[model samples]
Target: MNIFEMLRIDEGLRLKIYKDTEGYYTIGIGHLLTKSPSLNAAKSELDKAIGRNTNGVITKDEAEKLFNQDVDAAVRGILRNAKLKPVYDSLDAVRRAALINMVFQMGETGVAGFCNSLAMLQQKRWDEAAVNLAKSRWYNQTPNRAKRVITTFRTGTWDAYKNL
Candidate 1:
């Protein structure tokens, strides 16, 4: 599943904008509606959700359906470039989603610049891809994120970074 699907499942579905374990206005799949929503609060998001009681209320199913389509678009947009097609097909679902996440963060132009990494990805050289990823702007800009992607590219395990 893509991150969007994971988020939907992991967060669970809620039809109404209700408070979570913590005091916060969250709706649909763990989406933040406000810092907090209280029915008693004079002027608040809860009031708005109740008032707008209009057709604006978003149900969990609706959120998921819409986001699934959006996620599909994002995947297509990121991988549509002929050069990225190889990279898109070379990786697993998780890693493909990771590439989309990278594109989401840096835009297609930025991801396309990872020529060395893409070459490694196309060669199915996991370690080399990790190496190229380490030598990338994505790595320099976010070690925490790149660590996970690099570790997965090399080991195909989420916990690989615990040691690798």
Candidate 2:
């Protein structure tokens, strides 16, 4: 599967509003309400996308729409980032997926702050990049997912999340 497909599975679909692990209000495949332009804007998008005031629930199609938009936003954010864009473009598909996953989870700016890791990635130093990632609070916060993504970077293959 491609990065978008892999992210859809990794993030999982949610039809209703719920608190994420960090207690942010989220819905429809990891769309964070607080991170949106505004809650009104987000709710309006949800209502409009679902073709009515959903109150809470969204259709699968609507959820998929939000997922695509969210992933696209993540991608755009990375592409526009001065420090990350070239490094992001340099990776193969599997490693690109891992980078996008990181950007999706932490926001592109957060991922861009990985100066050492980005340099390692730019140099194609996979092991160093993985080691730099392991030194972060992001890694500590999401160990299981981080481990898989790091392994994907290290191995340059899709095997990390293929079976899942």
In model 2, which regions exceed 4 Å deviation? 35-45, 48-51
Candidate 1, residues 3-122, lDDT tens digits: the string is 664444334677655675446655565544555345434125433634544233565556575456545665888768877778888878767766766664455788888888888887
Residue 56, candidate 2: Cα error in Å is 1.3
Q: Alpha carbon lDDT of residue 29, candidate 1?
A: 56
TM-score: which candidate is best?
Answer: 2
C-alpha local distance difference test of each model: 0.63, 0.82
**Model 2 TM-score, 2 decimals:** 0.88
Candidate 2, residues 135-155, lDDT tens digits: the string is 999889888888988988898
Residue 30's lDDT in candidate 1: 55
Note each model's CA RMSD in angstroms. 7.7, 2.7
